[PDB]
Amino acid sequence: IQAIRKKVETQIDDLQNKTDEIAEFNQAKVLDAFQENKVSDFHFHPSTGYGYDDEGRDTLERVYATVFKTEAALVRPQIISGTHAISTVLFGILRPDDELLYITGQPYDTLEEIVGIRKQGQGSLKDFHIGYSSVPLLENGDVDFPRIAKKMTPKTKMIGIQRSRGYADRPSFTIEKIKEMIVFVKNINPEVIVFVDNCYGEFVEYQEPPEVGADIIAGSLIKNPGGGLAKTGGYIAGKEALVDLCGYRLTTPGIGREAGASLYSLLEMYQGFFLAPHVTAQAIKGARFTAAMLAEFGVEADPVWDAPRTDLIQSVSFHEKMVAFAQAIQAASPVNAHVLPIGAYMPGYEDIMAAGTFIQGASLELTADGQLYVQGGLTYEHIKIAVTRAIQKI
Template sequence: MFFDNRITELAEQAEERAQSRFREIDKLIDHNQWKVIRAFQKHKVSDYHFAGSTGYGYNDRGREVLDLVYADVFGAEAALVRPHFASGTHTISTALFGVLRPGDKLLYITGTPYDTLHKVIGKPGDGKGSLADFGIGYGEVALTSDGSPDWDAIRIALQDGDVKVVGIQRSRGYDWRRSFTVEQIGQMVRFVKEINPNLVVFVDNCYGEFTEELEPPQVGVDLIAGSLIKNPGGGIASTGGYIAGRRELVELAAYRHTAPGIGGEVGAMLGATHSMYQGLFLAPHMVGQAVKGAVLAAALFEGLGFETSPAWNEVRTDLIQAIRFTSAEHLVTFVQGIQRAAAVDAHVVPEPWDMPGYEHPVIMAAGTFIQGGSLELSADAPIREPYIAYMQGGLTYAHAKFGVLTALQNMINHHLL
C-alpha cells in the first residue's frame, strides 16, 4: 500500500517529536530485559525445562521453575503460570473465587471494571455461578471527574466489615480515563492498608506488564493476574495466564484452578512450556515496540486535531492508546484500517457485533497470529458515544507504524480526513 505524501510527512514529523520518548522506552526495555534474564539465570533455566508433560503432570520441573521465574520477575512470593487459563477474564475469575468466600465482599475502587468481568461479578441468584450467585457481595467506588481515586468515598466504603478484597483495574478498559501507574497503585495500597491491614488488594494487571520498571507486588499489592496472550507472553505463548502475589493467596487460587488439596502440583503443560519461557524472555522488547507504536499513534493523531489519551509525551503504564473520534463512521473506518495492515486476515473487513461478555456491539481489528493476542497490533471499540478507539500492540515498531499509517489512509480514502 502506498501512502499519501501528507501522511508520510506527518509520520516523519511525529517521529522526530517523539525521539526523546523513544530513548526513554529503550532504557525501559533494557531494564526489564535484564530483569527477566537475571530471573532465568537465578533459577538455572535449561533446555530440559522446556519438555512437555502429560496426564497429571506430576513433578514437571519446567512448570515449577516457570512459576519461580514469574514470581521473581513480578516481585512476588509465588506465581501460578498455566496454559489452562482460557483468557484474562478466566484468570482474574480464578484469583477472585480463590480468595473470596460466601459473605465476603469485593470492592472495586477504580470504578466499574472491564465489561467482561460484569458476568463474573453477577447478580444474586443468577444461577450462572457468578460471585453473587455464591453469596459474595460487590461494591464499587466511582472515580472523580478527573479520573482519580475518590479517597473520601473509599474510606466510607471500607467501613463495611464484609469487604475482604479491594480490586484495582490498572488499565483504562473502555473508559476515557488515565490508566493507573504502579506508583499510583502503591498510593492506593497504602491508603487501604492504613484503614484495614487485613484487606487483600487485588490488581487486574492486564496490558500493564513491562511498561514500567516496577510491577504492582513491588508496591504492596497482594495478588495480581494477567493474560499470556497479552504482554508477558511476548507474542509467542499461544494461550494461558498467570497469577502472582503472596504465597498463601496464590495457593488458594491454585486450589480454585484445579481442586482443593491438588493446587499447582498437577497440570500437564501439553508442550506449551517452551513458548511460555521464550515468550517471557521476549516480552520486555515486544512490549517496548508496542509502546513506541502507541506513542507514534498519539503524536500523529494529535497533529491532525484528534484528542488522544495518553498524549504522546505523557507517562505510560499500559499498551492502550485511546483516540477519540467524532462519529461511529470515523471509529469503524479507523478500526477497519488497522485490520488492513495485518499480516494475517488483512482481507477480512471487521464489522460491529454482539461479542460475548460485552454490553454493546464491539468492532475488533485482530489480524493476529494468536487469536485475540493483543500484544500484536489490534484495535477495538464499543459502538457507543463517545466514539473512542482503543489501539494496542505491535510486535515490531515497523508494524505498529504501518498500522497507524494504513488506518489514516483508509480514513482519507473514505473522505473522513
C-alpha cells in the same frame, strides 16, 4: 506524508529512548530471573497425564514469581484467559459473607458477570454469598478516597484495583497512583488483601504492583507477558498461601497447583516471557507514534504523545468516521487482512474489532476495537506502517 513523519518522529524521540531504557532494564530483570532459576533446555520438555513433578512448569512459575517480585505464581494453559485468571483469584480467596470492593470504578464488562451484576444463577460471587460493590471515580479520573473509606467495612476481605482503563473513559493508573491507593486502604485495614488486575501493564514501567504493596495480581498471556508467542493463558502472581488457594480453585481442593500437564506449551511461554519487555516496548513506542500522528491530523487522542505511560492502551476519539480507520488496521495486518471487520457479539460484553493476528484474540499483536482503542504491535515497524496507511485513508 514523509515530511510529517520526520517531524513527528523527531518530536517523540527522547520519549522513545526512555521507553528503550525501561525495555533494557526489564530485559535484564527477566534475563536475571532465568539465571537465578537455572533455566535449562530440560525445562521445555512436555509433561502428560496428571502433570505431577513437572519441573518445567514449576520453574516457569518461579521465573514469573521472581520477575514480579512475588513469593509464587501460577502460569498455565489450564488458565484460559485474563478473565479466568482474575476469576480464579476472586473465587480462590473469597468465601461466603466476604465483600470485594473495587476502588477504581466499575471494572471491565465481563467482571460484571463474574461478580453477579449480570448473569445471576450461573455461579457468580453473589450465588456463593460473596458481596461486591465498586467506588465510582471522580470526574477527573482520580479515585474517591473519602468514599473508599466509607465503603470499607469489617467484611471487606479484598480491594480490587483495575490498572488499565479498558473501555472506560478514564486514565489508566500508574504504579505510583496504585501505591498511593494501596497505602490508603492498608492504613484503614492492614489485613485487607489487595488485588490488581494487571492486564496491559506488564513491563511498561520499572515496577509491577506487588513491589508497591499488591498482595496478588493477575493477567493474560495473549497480552504483554506472552511476548506474542504464548498461544493461550493467564497468570496469577502473589503471596504463597494466596497462590495455593488460587490453585485449589483452578484444579480442586487437595490437589491444587501440583497437577496440570504442561503438554507442548512450555518453550513458547519461556521464550515469550523473555521477549516480553522488548515486545511491550514496541507496542508503547507505536502507541506514542500513533498518538502523535493522529494529533497531526486533528484527531483527539488519549494518552497524548507526551503523557505518562503505564499500559499499552491508546484511544483515538473520532466520536462511522472511524470505520475507515479500524478496518484500515485489519487491512494493514498480516493475517486475514482481506476480512474487513464490523460490530458483532463479543462474549462477556453486552454492547469493529480489528484482529488480523497469529493467535486468536491476542492483543500484544496490532489490534483496534471501538474512539477506537488501537494498541499492540509485535514490531515498532509494523505499527508505523499500519498507522501511516490507516491515517492515509482517513
